[PDB]
């Protein structure tokens, strides 16, 4: 996985503009959303037997 930072550096130096930056930022947002959903699923797992008081 060290290949990602290298290609990232050499592509930012050469291939970058606002269209590319917007694409990348939107992808970052979607990834953050996926992580939030993962946490929601695990909280569902945790609180299933706790909200049901009896």
């Amino acid at each position: 996985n060290i290949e990602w930072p290298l290609v990232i550096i050499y592509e930012y130096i050469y291939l970058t503009n606002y269209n590319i930056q917007n694409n990348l930022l939107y992808n970052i947002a979607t990834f953050i959303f996926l992580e939030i959903l993962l946490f929601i699923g695990f909280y569902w797992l945790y609180i299933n037997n706790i909200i049901h008081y009896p």
């Binding site: 930012y12 050469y14 291939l15 970058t16 503009n17 606002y18 269209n19």
Partner: protein, 157 residues
């Protein structure tokens, strides 16, 4: 009292091409929007401005064609299109595309419009920091253009 220097943006290549000529590149990548349903209703009942349209030659005549410009390689066929409904009898549901030879008079016999799709190649200085900062003359450019015409040049991909 102190001196501040803002950190410049060092990126070259596509970014420096964009920042050298922001008008042309923005023109290339600027989204424009079409009318919604209520806007179409509000536009279809707007008035003409003057009686010129009854006398002049419309935009898209055999003598006043619609000239459009794409970027690409010399001689490559140009992709152009309508948004539909340039005529009452022409479809308007969706955009209709066209492949046409460059620098030739074409006629759409759906709407009846004459157009001049043509190509301008985006030949630009190799963006590696050696670009010129002051007015340049025709000699070095002459050499580069001669080489491009005779052999071709790489693509910025």
């Amino acid at each position: 009292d102190s001196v501040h220097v803002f950190r410049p943006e060092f990126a070259q290549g596509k970014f420096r091409i964009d920042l050298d000529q922001p008008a042309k590149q923005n023109k290339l990548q600027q989204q424009i929007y079409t009318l919604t349903d209520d806007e179409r209703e509000m536009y279809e009942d707007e008035p003409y401005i003057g009686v010129d349209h009854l006398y002049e030659a419309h935009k898209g005549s055999k003598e006043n064609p619609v000239v459009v410009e794409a970027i690409g390689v010399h001689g490559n066929d140009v992709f152009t299109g309508c948004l539909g409904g340039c005529h009452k009898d022409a479809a308007d549901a969706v955009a209709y595309y066209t492949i046409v030879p460059p620098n030739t008079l074409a006629v759409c016999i759906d709407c009846g419009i004459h157009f001049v799709a043509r190509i301008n190649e985006q030949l630009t200085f190799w963006p590696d920091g050696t670009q010129p900062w002051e007015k340049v003359d025709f000699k070095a450019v002459e050499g580069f253009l001669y080489k491009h015409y005779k052999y071709g040049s790489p693509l910025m991909i």
